[PDB]
Enzyme design. Structure first.
Site, PDB file in Angstrom:
ATOM      1  N   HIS A   1       0.871  -1.080   0.017  1.00  0.00           N
ATOM      2  CA  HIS A   1       0.006   0.155   0.085  1.00  0.00           C
ATOM      3  C   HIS A   1       0.802   1.280  -0.049  1.00  0.00           C
ATOM      4  CE1 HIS A   1      -1.780  -3.095   2.915  1.00  0.00           C
ATOM      5  NE2 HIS A   1      -2.766  -3.188   1.881  1.00  0.00           N
TER       6      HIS A   1
ATOM      7  N   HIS B   1       0.681   4.736   1.851  1.00  0.00           N
ATOM      8  CA  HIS B   1       0.387   5.059   2.902  1.00  0.00           C
ATOM      9  C   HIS B   1       0.492   6.675   2.896  1.00  0.00           C
ATOM     10  CE1 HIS B   1       0.146   1.545   5.804  1.00  0.00           C
ATOM     11  NE2 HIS B   1       0.576   1.019   4.738  1.00  0.00           N
TER      12      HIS B   1
ATOM     13  N   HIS C   1      -3.435   4.042   5.373  1.00  0.00           N
ATOM     14  CA  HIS C   1      -3.496   4.070   3.828  1.00  0.00           C
ATOM     15  C   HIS C   1      -4.046   5.308   3.587  1.00  0.00           C
ATOM     16  CE1 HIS C   1      -4.160  -0.709   4.158  1.00  0.00           C
ATOM     17  NE2 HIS C   1      -3.226  -0.144   4.566  1.00  0.00           N
TER      18      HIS C   1
ATOM     19  N   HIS D   1     -11.238   0.318   3.034  1.00  0.00           N
ATOM     20  CA  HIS D   1     -10.321  -0.468   2.212  1.00  0.00           C
ATOM     21  C   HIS D   1     -10.757  -1.395   1.380  1.00  0.00           C
ATOM     22  CE1 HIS D   1      -6.407  -2.439   1.931  1.00  0.00           C
ATOM     23  NE2 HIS D   1      -7.206  -3.660   2.337  1.00  0.00           N
TER      24      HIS D   1
ATOM     25  N   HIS E   1      -9.057   2.393  -1.096  1.00  0.00           N
ATOM     26  CA  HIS E   1      -8.567   3.652  -0.733  1.00  0.00           C
ATOM     27  C   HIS E   1      -7.399   3.969  -1.968  1.00  0.00           C
ATOM     28  CE1 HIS E   1      -8.350   2.269   3.946  1.00  0.00           C
ATOM     29  NE2 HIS E   1      -9.393   2.960   3.465  1.00  0.00           N
TER      30      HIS E   1
ATOM     31  N   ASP F   1      -4.518   1.530  -2.053  1.00  0.00           N
ATOM     32  CA  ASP F   1      -4.553   0.002  -1.895  1.00  0.00           C
ATOM     33  C   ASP F   1      -4.199  -0.748  -3.491  1.00  0.00           C
ATOM     34  OD1 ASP F   1      -5.871   0.335   0.454  1.00  0.00           O
ATOM     35  OD2 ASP F   1      -7.827   0.303   0.025  1.00  0.00           O
TER      36      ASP F   1
ATOM     37  N   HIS G   1       3.877  -5.325   3.873  1.00  0.00           N
ATOM     38  CA  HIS G   1       3.446  -5.321   5.053  1.00  0.00           C
ATOM     39  C   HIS G   1       3.779  -7.125   5.726  1.00  0.00           C
ATOM     40  CE1 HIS G   1       0.794  -2.466   6.454  1.00  0.00           C
ATOM     41  NE2 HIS G   1       0.757  -2.079   5.128  1.00  0.00           N
TER      42      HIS G   1
ATOM     43  N   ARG H   1       4.546  -3.598   9.576  1.00  0.00           N
ATOM     44  CA  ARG H   1       5.136  -3.079   8.365  1.00  0.00           C
ATOM     45  C   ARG H   1       6.797  -3.656   8.286  1.00  0.00           C
ATOM     46  NH1 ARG H   1       2.132   2.748   8.773  1.00  0.00           N
ATOM     47  NH2 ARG H   1       0.156   1.656   9.347  1.00  0.00           N
TER      48      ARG H   1
HETATM   49 CU   LIG Z   1       0.097  -0.681   4.089  1.00  0.00          CU
HETATM   50 ZN   LIG Z   2      -6.522   0.614   2.273  1.00  0.00          ZN
END
Ligand SMILES: [Cu+2]
Ligand SMILES: [Zn+2]
Ligand SMILES: CN1CCN(c2ncnc3ccccc23)CC1
Ligand SMILES: CN1CCN(c2ncnc3ccccc23)CC1
Ligand SMILES: CN1CCN(c2ncnc3ccccc23)CC1
Ligand SMILES: [Cu+2]
Ligand SMILES: [Zn+2]
Lengths: 153, 153
Positions: A46, A48, A63, A71, A80, A83, A120, A143
């Site tokens: 993602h 962020h 995100h 999400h 998002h 995403d 992640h 993360r």
């Molecule tokens: Cu992420």
């Molecule tokens: Zn998301």
């Protein structure tokens, strides 16, 4: 064309280089590169909100979500902006990344430049996990590596 | 206000956190923080064109120079947009950074977000060194630490 790049690093073995290119400001962004040192399977991937790594990847915030949506996965309307789904690693620890996305941008209000790309610990369930966390983070866990997305040559 | 941040990392460790804040898009940017691990004296301090750290700080390219001007100090009309002068370290190896600048921005054509901040080996002569390289790099030498400037909370 507009180009961007991200060097992913963290406290463990996960590291990678991701490139972005957008031929037209109203067009899709191609995203490609490699991430190594991963456990086998899916890893959430993602953009962020913040390009802040002061205290590590935690500093990047949630995100990137300028439209205040839930999400989802990259092929969903409800997602998002940040995403980008999952990258998938083999028993060589490598995820090859090659995707095209129509929602991120390298200019305008959906611009991801100056924000953080994060890989992640666990799979992103793409908002289909059937719990509250699924529609916020996808249950992708901690993360492992991140970097600020920068303007490229 | 608009805010940005940069985590500088290099061997030494030369490391620092630099914060940026701009009350309005038409206004000056306050720059503050702390860099440690430096040799005593002046170190060139600039925004470079690319936010690319693929192969380290070298990947950031030349000073950010959207207007095609020669290198100078921050007080000079003739300067690159990225020309933020020097930081000065004491014997303890710490430089305290406190700058206000009217030429960098955190939005628009002169936006530095997504680009790389670099601290250099040697002093920047602010284009007053009397040789060819003075009006290109300020003779500040190699790149001790850098980071991509990101959007902050
Ligand atoms: Cu992420
Ligand atoms: Zn998301
Ligand atoms: C296919 N694409 C869709 C997304 N797109 C955008 N880029 C930047 N900002 C935007 C703000 C609002 C809506 C769309 C935006 C670029 C091209
Ligand atoms: C405009 N372009 C952007 C994409 N592009 C690529 N270049 C190099 N490697 C790639 C690997 C996978 C996918 C795209 C790649 C070059 C052509
Ligand atoms: C209005 N503002 C509040 C935040 N701000 C600062 N905050 C914390 N420390 C600082 C050290 C040196 C210079 C400015 C600083 C400057 C902008
Ligand atoms: Cu420099
Ligand atoms: Zn310069």
């Amino acid at each position: 064309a507009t180009k961007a790049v991200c060097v992913l690093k963290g406290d463990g073995p996960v590291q990678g280089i991701i490139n972005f290119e957008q031929k037209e400001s109203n067009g899709p962004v191609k995203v490609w590169g490699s991430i190594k040192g991963l456990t086998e399977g899916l890893h959430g991937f993602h953009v962020h909100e913040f390009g802040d790594n002061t205290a590590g990847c935690t500093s990047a915030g949630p995100h990137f979500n300028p439209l205040s949506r839930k999400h989802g996965g990259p092929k969903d309307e409800e997602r998002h902006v940040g995403d980008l789904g999952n990258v998938t690693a083999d028993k060589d620890g490598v995820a090859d990344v090659s995707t095209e996305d129509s929602v991120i941008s390298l200019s305008g209000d959906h611009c991801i430049t100056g924000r953080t790309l994060v890989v992640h610990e666990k799979a992103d369930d793409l908002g289909k996990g059937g719990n509250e966390e699924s529609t916020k983070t996808g249950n992708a866990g901690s993360r492992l590596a991140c970097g600020v997305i920068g303007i490229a040559q």
